[PDB]
Amino acid sequence: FDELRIGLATADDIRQWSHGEVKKPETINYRTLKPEKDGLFCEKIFGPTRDWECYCGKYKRVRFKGIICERCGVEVTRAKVRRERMGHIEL
């Protein structure tokens, strides 16, 4: 903490911040009450809803953290990453 530089955020910078692309307005399935795919709240882009728990029922334990499951693409980690990770919308 020495200086909070602030300035215009170009398109390249916003792409750099984003960990993915949001392509749908879907939020959560009305029955399973889980985030849908690649919409808002998507785990593939933002993060896992439950600690280290992916979406598809595959790798589901604290031991094997720091890997991406090829089924749903969720990167197992702490749920707190959902408070940091941010996406973007291409117009």
List the binding residues for Zn(2+). 54, 56, 69, 72
71 scored as a contact of another protein (CB under 8 A): no
Both tokens assigned to 80: 């707190």
Q: CB 3 → Zn ion: shortest distance, Å?
A: 41
Q: Is 71 in the site for Zn ion (CB under 5 A)?
A: yes
Q: Which of 9, 56, 67, 68 binds another protein (CB under 8 A)?
A: 9
Burial class (CB in 10 A: 0-12, 13-18, 19+), 54: buried
Asked if residue 46 lies in contact with residue 87, where contact means CB atoms within 8 angstroms, the answer is yes
Which tokens in the block code for residue 31?
């029955």
Binding site for Zn ion (CB under 5 A): 54-56, 58, 69, 71-72
